[model samples]
Target chain A: TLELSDLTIALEEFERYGITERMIIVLKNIQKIVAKNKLCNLNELKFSSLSRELKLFEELLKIPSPPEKIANSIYKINDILESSIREFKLCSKNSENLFFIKPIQKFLVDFQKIVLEKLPLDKKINKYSNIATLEKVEFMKNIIKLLINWKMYSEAVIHLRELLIDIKLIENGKYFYYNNKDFREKYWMYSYNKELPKKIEELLKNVKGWRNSVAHGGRANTSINQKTLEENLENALSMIDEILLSMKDLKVSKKIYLLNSTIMPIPKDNQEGKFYILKLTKNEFKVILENAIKDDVLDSAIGHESVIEFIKDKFELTVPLKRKEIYFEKGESALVIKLEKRKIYTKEEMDFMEENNLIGYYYIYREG
Target chain B: TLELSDLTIALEEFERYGITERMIIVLKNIQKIVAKNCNLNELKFSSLSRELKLFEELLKIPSPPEKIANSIYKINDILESSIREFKLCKPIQKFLVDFQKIVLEKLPLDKKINKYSNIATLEKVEFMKNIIKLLINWKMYSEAVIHLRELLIDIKLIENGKYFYYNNKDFREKYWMYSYNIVDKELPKKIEELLKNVKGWRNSVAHGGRANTSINQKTLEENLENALSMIDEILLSMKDLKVNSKKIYLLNSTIMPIPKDNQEGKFYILKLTKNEFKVILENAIKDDVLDSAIGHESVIEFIKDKFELTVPLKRKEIYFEKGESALVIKLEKRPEEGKIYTKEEMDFMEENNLIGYYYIYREG
Candidate 1:
């Protein structure tokens, strides 16, 4: 038989999961009534205050609809409350039959379980649904972390699949359904285009049929063993790392042209000749410069590759050029003069220059 | 009756509080045994796996020894095995005795207070304040009040001229004699009144009285709220004196490169003096595009070009200390502008949709 202490413990535990202020007041009222009567158990207890509090709780639930995500759970709680209230009313009518308080106790336990275990997770899943793609991926990853920490390996793998779906590494639609094999194939193809390093490909082999087994509720013949689950978790963590790196690299490749650039003519024997300075990616700087030269926008008197090589050898591209005129009289074929007369352009000037196909033009002014 | 479902729920709740992997393995083993036998309650359950797992949990806690002695004692209580089994296992009995001895030897409250006072900082003080709020939320009124007094001492609100350590006699005297150097005159009086009202209840609970029965829950809740509100008021008043009067600026620097590392970006709180912060804020206001919000990127670039301040790479360096504040910047969405068209203007535009007209208005 449950005692007053048990009910008190239950109320205290229920408080941990956030409850409405009105609900707390109602519960506290119930607590006071139970303590005042010194009721050892809820059995054989029929008081006016108890019924009033229950009725009040029922009325509070009827006033407002819950969020759509947890609406069904809330409805279930209401249904249980209704049953308890009906039992109480029937018991009150029939004074001969002893009132069974078990239904009320059952209501409290179910309410605690739904609110504590079910509602928060449902609310979180709904909250993350409409967020940014990367944010959703992070949320899913954190869920996986929590699940793995709780030793829910099967659930962790299921969330891993969801994360892959969020990052677009695996297909989502029923028509374009992809299993682990298909995921590996699609992943290899995406990585090939992105030119991911070979070391990262090894992580893919660790993924197994655990996702299918857990996702379909073990309709598949194979269930994930402990060893395979552990291996898969490590693989999932590495996959997240690779996904973040690949996304970052994709951004870098797309916006590499936006890095600060300066175009200046190389001086030959006190005479200005055509040459444009451009900051290009390390891998394809020469090719980009050759394309610029072919467009007749940027020019060089010497061979394009040779001049780029010479510039790379002569100056540090990472640091800004010193703000003063200087001479580079190194070569015997022609005396080279370097003019450091560039001014950093404002954001507005840069946008105008970019629109006019003069992205690398460094504004220059003669010393007064 | 503790059903299989009940054990599962308990395990889930325990996991939320962060248990070790080995502890989880032990608990899962016990869960499996209970499920297999369909034991509806713990009173009738008896199995080698249960005993072994419970023993393992107890042994695992020894790794922390004194640090986690409470966990050790909890596991020992649940170790419902025969005396013959426990007596034969000398190591288990010895471990139980050792654990009890260690748990009994706890650091005194005063020593803990002194240690906290010694290592106090603005961030740590804020952290302690939040922890006290959490304690109050959990209805640990006595602990919360005690920590509140310690926090006041750490921030020098309830300190003697020479000492930082907390003393019961000294705390009682200093709490009443505490003077406010802050701008607000009424805040000090309100704090003293609230503290006096809650002081009796705090002493009752601290001396092993029940919180719920000694003081009504409503009164306790009100007192806790008043305590937190007073602390917040005091913090706000102190912040004004610390930041404005002392000429310190708490600049929220979202983007800046530390001198050591160039590739990575991080958010930093730059502690700037009045003159440096004024110059940056004024210049940023002048350079703002829409005359409302300053562009974060432009401010960063301006700082990089004009100031010679160094940004700290690590968190320890970000603590308030004697130094020039470095420049950091953030970016915002560019504001948009649109033209409104009336019905008559739309009718004229539709009649000549492809044609456009422009005129310029000049001042006389």
Candidate 2:
């Protein structure tokens, strides 16, 4: 004869094996079944086969390493029985009613492990440095597949729309830019010119319609089926891959020059020193030349013809008074008149001017 | 004996009452249960009592069943209907959320009034009115009709001094009977009739009820047009109740309204300095009252009335014709270059320390 205490002791012993939560739920259901049937003493049961089978199942669970296939089959049966008692409050003697659970669980788990877990979604998503955004994308990817597996086509499409929004591939419908008439035209023009593949283009075009219908409770005249939904899922993945590839290749910088008509030299009183007559057409050009001029190379001064003659005699180079001539029509005006300054050029500046073909010359100027 | 055939016949019978697709799902689950049990011949079962109870329960539900079964069926029906309705109304629900967000974040409401306070009722009504017009222009007839109904109720509550508090039943009973305080008596009746017709269509679309006719594209357009026209009439009526009677004057482009009583007094020419004019112009532009394109003559008249100035007839156009900058320069010039002031005006200016200063004036 077996007492109810024996089942309780066995359950406690099974916990020591670190059995999964799935197995624990099954054992709890078995405990409920025994109490409800008044089968506390197994010897009094009408069907010897039933009592023997229950004893054998309990003994099998007690083993630290039971046969994997046999143990999973028992867990599956108990899972169904648990649901039956919970939902209908009925205890069944026959276990044949639960035969469908094994195949369905096998089918779903196989797909999850063999297909979904092996996808490159995580690998590709991690390449982008935005940690929060990448995590959200990965989370949505998992949720989308789970929803698809559950046969929730509309909900899956909605999540797909959200995923696209997070990556900025789709505009959020609530924004003023999306809703406004003129702004939406520009947005669509920009979106269409992304040069996405034809498959991706078709997918993007239909996603809004799918999302709207599903999100709005089938307000629009549309229905979704599993086949097209799976196809869309594939297309969405491809689109994501394309977007990631484009993001990885992004690069940008700036180098600009704003020009004017005339350059006026900086005014200064004559000092007793060597000087140079350097003609520059732009203010920036003159400033660069002035910074480079040094005492040993050339002392810079503007609008001095005598210094020009002295520089020609010294260097045997005709340092012209004006490097570039300016022309003006009757009504034409100079946009700006920039002032240049007198300075000495450093050796490096002289080398720089000579390398860059800048206008300068050596000269001697002294005041009496 | 309860045969497999018996359960099949029971399922077929249950469908005769037009059971919803939700019930069909439960029946399918039962069918799977029966096939797997091999209890096609009920007499062969070891537990005849369990079998008997299952048969009895199935028979009871050839119509409907126990507390547990009935509750499950009821829940399933609710869930099915809820999903169906959610799909139908989701866009409207999203639109409403977005509409409220825009109202709270973007609309120009009185900052001093608390959002949930009674004083805010009028401001909320104004916002709803604006939103309704926008929806109508966007051709969203259903949304426009819905807001129009609420706007009418609020308007009615405001008229009655009820502080705009009302429930669903309040709208139904009082929406038609409310009057707009307009001189045109026939206009109110026309608006009421339009609202009544639109309310029926709104109910049909929103609640899935039968109406006299379905709303086609043409009907949507007609209803929206009627809604727009009705709002215009309501606005006109509201204007009649709150007419702004003060005369508006333009000082250099900034609009200043003076009460009728204040216009009769002699105005003081305070002679604002350049710094004072700069600060005033900055504030005027910030306040959005400045109309930069206001005519020179309008400005002259504004200055004359506001300052109570007796301008020399010839010099009337001198200060303003060339624009605000020119006007500022002219105002700063010494008084001697212009025509002389009267003895009283000169003594008033001297006492006020207005000598050697610009000619712009301010009302005391």
Candidate 3:
């Protein structure tokens, strides 16, 4: 029974949301529908109310804001509303009515900058492959999952076949074979020691034949559905694991990558800080260090001397900047960088890391 | 233990199966492995999947069994085929149920058998054997082919009103196995040639596009020859596949026309396969009126040698129409087994022709 008048005490909150007349109407009707439908199980909501709710948002979304961020803030306003309805549907399925409260409250939260970040699928493909062996396997597994969930069995089969082509790179220890013969020859070779069952052997052989037909631009004889595709993928993944284990010599070069996040850390989090370990060439480190300087062009000793000169020279400028360079060490491996004082990174340097798309702990930033 | 005895029986079954030695070894090992893994449940037997198990059980029936076997097999068949574990599996479920019922479901055999009543079941058995043989042979011809097995299953389903094979044209187009030669280069000439001939009857026999389109001997011979010759060309096309091309033994050697009574002087249809057939034209009249009846010319000559002729055995010159057949006439008339009547009988035959033909109402 939270009315417009009851919410008048929260009028400032509504202004922060860029609350439109249409959004207000939609919000008002939300209470109406909720009360009407026994506290609003979303699936139980009549289509008229759902359509009206969607329509109001559609109208609210069309309203112009002076800045893109404000427009984004409106999408956020709409996001809370959208998530409330969507989450309610999920909750209603599970018979949980409590979760809808927070998202509905979020609709009235202060407007914030809506960062528009988009990542291309292929970019993700590259990022996944540019790491450890398991990561590359994960990428293939994920893509197969995506295709199978979308019911693209034909495409999934082709990708799985493509997955097997990597076997050509893993040579047989006993013999040399052509790329075309690698799979079949290995299978036949495997059968000598292990008595492969007829169904399993036939399935694998048939898969190879099917893959060949697709490779040769022939259509599959039968269309595959999700249930069949799921088993096909599961079997193939297990088969891949088995084959990889059989080939002991196959190796993948591994390296770790930085984990980036858009969320800033909040204060009063007393857990010991986890500073990021960023690995980079001396040249990349120099760029971050120079960017951290107050007046970089005049102050940096980049060409004159290396980090040693800058540390010694900057210390002479102010008593506060004494820069006692204690416990400084150089190593062959990349390590975390920090100011000597407090053995902690300066606020400006941490901000630079955040700006440069590197990981940083929160607790120090979200406060005034 | 039952294991040794079962294995021996299975080996005999494999011998009956006529599989390769490598395949026999594999099947033997499959039993052994499955036995060992029974407690573990680790081995995934694809054949034990619902549809496949149902398929095997249905296959095991020697024609139609008696009530006890029928109920037992049927209970398993319904349950196994009912389990829709795969998308493609589910679509064919109704078809499988209907097909088993039509082909292998026991029916009372008390009544005397007649041609009219026995056509569907007879053709069902004949089609099943021939189609399965085609699939296995085509697989042997070249293992890469995809749709032969699909078509073999679908053909019976369509014949039994269980499913459609897209259309006869589409079915015939994919009939040949993969030829490395044709897979790379142009389709061989004989296949194209057969495709052209088969197109004539594809609609007529399959979809009944035109009800009045009568087929005679030449048409029947055209289709049969094309079917056989295309099989040969398909074999020839597999020269690169390196499998020895031998004549595929389909049926226990069969021959046409085991002479019977009452079939004399009757106009009838002769079927080449279950699907492809032609009409035998007969002229039923006195000598002067023989020219008045509608018929193929060679049919007169067929009658000259076929039966007792009255007019001093005048051998009219036989000019064969593309696919037409004979007429049998007798001077001193005795009652015959076939539709025997005068000019008055024609009207009755015409009535039966339009209405008595097979018809079933389907919901779809």
Candidate 4:
């Protein structure tokens, strides 16, 4: 049983990677560039406001503190700035310089470069597929959230449609035909009591009307000012939020498991010897299984490095045991081997494992 | 008098222009050119569609006159700037030249009556009266209040009283609908007073406007009746004393004619004593007449507050202040535009104190 406390390790491992203190350095460079060029724009003012918030957040993070308020303020400011970036057009054709828009573009490119450079060290922590996918979701929803907050209803609906398609691809493990009905059936399967599919379906049909009417020589909007737009985007966000929560619920469903299998490795060093086979749950099995299949599929499941490190971290060891994978063509999917080198394991520790049955030797059988 | 049939002539002047069948044919040719070449990018597409939308709106018989010169000038300015920014293919370039020629040629020298211009109260009042009926018929009482409040501002402008809120559409459309009333004696002044008091409720209802809301039938009936009386009074005063529907479906900002009108009975007004009204609320609650109403408490509270009386108090404690002695409310059954209440329901409303009405409560 995954006890109640075990149910509560509610961390999105991907969310741990972020625009670190380096982003502050980059933002300072952009501010310096703006000053050097002597360019002034509303966006520059907006960025300065954002930098102050972000700088404060960084300062607060240095201390051992909750700092949730500044952290939240930084998140909202980031969203607003991102929205502004997407909406901005260089309308001042007469200006002498590239202005803040150029600097911002450079900032994004540099940020992505920084992320790529940190990849090697970051991969030791979690899967990049998890990190990339979660970040993309954050960006897409952030843009959509800003447009909605600004009461740009038509634009908001368009981006919501785009984000929904991206979410579909993510849900189906990177490859699936686009079908809205299929998405609802698959993702919203768990909660009939809190069913949100009907509302989502209605909003989907309604929002499509906005794009169609404008795209085909009809009126884009009639009386859809801020008031009406506020109402529309409010409902749209709720529907998106429901679908998002459903995706999280899907993750929670697979997190708790009980093991029912054992694996034993064949002798590798040409020495007649026995090895330890551990009884592990599906949660642990999937954790190891994810590493084997990660290169082939865009899986968010746990990987080998984190799992191996975690074992030693949780249980202190003098000389840690080494492990290896043994893939099978049939019968069992895969087997993991943990071998102790000759004389590496002390006699006292060996005696303890044998007496407690913490480890066992296994034999495989198959019908031919 | 603001008769029900006055809704037929409620069309705005500018809305008369529409794209011709000939223009649509020419538009198709241009569309084909763009499609065949794939010449436009994101910037071009955005600029082109906006230009197209404006061109379609400027469509008219004998061409749009000097009354629309400033709009034409703005369109030309936008197109010329886009022409500089975007290098178009030859066919599209030819189309822009021809489009500019059409606007330039139609630029009339004589500036006709600008009814929508500054301080022209006579025309402004007529415009407001027409629109008031249009909004009411569409059952957009909240929107009607917005326009009615603007009309009151126009009246104030005519009276040579200066106020600055008229220019701001945000203040006018938002605050007015919620504020004006069972409402006006300058009639506009009375509406202004009535509207100021109802601002809170108006915002709550209008929030659901064109999208969602739960509006009471009684409130709608009362607002519609007040609108009729206000228009009747203002127009009557204009005719001799001093200076002075067709069931129309409001499609967008335009009043559209749909040809079939099932005649519906309209709302009537009443002047009553405050004590008589309090008796109705008390008896309605006591005899379980209000049992079916979902918001019966709010109704009692609104009525009690109107009369300066406490809630659920014995009927004996109810007394009217000097100015509060007279209370006027509208009584109606079929405030529905395309339909009406049956005779039986009307008779029932009369026998019981199940009266539906509105009152203009103002502070001295």
For each candidate, give its TM-score against the true structure.
0.24, 0.22, 0.24, 0.24
Q: Poorest 10 consecutive residues of model 3 chain A by lDDT?
A: A111-120
Summarize candidate 3's per-residue lDDT along A1-368 as a digit string, tens digits. 34543244233322322123334454555566556645545433443443344344322222110112222333444445455555554553334444444444444332112111110022222221211233233344555554444333333454454344334322321111111233333443353213223334543564664343322212223323334445656777776666555544442221111112222232343443322232333233333233233322212112212223333443322111222211211211111223222233454564455456543311111112
lDDT winner between 3 and 4, please give it: 4
Query: Which runs in model 4 stand beyond 4 Å of their true positions?
Result: A1-142, A148-155, A166-194, A209-211, A214-231, A242-368, B1-364
**How close to the true structure is residue A253 of candidate 2, measured as C-alpha lDDT?**
14
Model 2 over residues B240-304: C-alpha lDDT tens digits? 45211111112332222234455332222333344334433443444443333333443334334
lDDT of 4 at B231: 58
Candidate 1, A1-368: lDDT as tens digits: 34554454445444443223334444455556455544334332333333444333322221111122123334344444545455444543333222324434454555555444533233233322221234345545654565455344433553464455445542121111112334333543453322443434344334443444333222112333445556768777877776666655232111012112242323456664433222222222333333333443332332223223334443322212322433322221111222222334444554454355443322121111
Task: Sort all candidates by TM-score, best to worst.
Answer: 1, 3, 4, 2
True contacts kept of 1: 0.00
Which pairs of residues collide in model 4? A259-A281, B4-B245, B5-B245, B179-B195, B179-B196, B180-B195, B184-B187, B208-B212, B238-B244, B239-B244
Give the per-residue lDDT digits (tens) of candidate 1, residues B1-364.
Answer: 3344444434333333222332344445444544654234442223423443443333211111111223333344443332233344223244334332332332111212222222233443455566555444433333354455545554553222212122223433464356545564554565555556556455332322211123334565676677677667766665534221111222333322244533433332423233333344444333331112223333333334434432222222332222222233321221123323334544454365422211111101
Docking verdict class for candidate 4: incorrect
Tens digits of per-residue lDDT for model 4 on A131-217?
Answer: 114334444465455434322233344345545554544554431112233442344232222244454455455555443221111
Model 2, A21-50: lDDT tens digits are 323444444445444554323222322232
For each candidate, the alpha-carbon lDDT, in order, equals: 0.37, 0.36, 0.32, 0.38
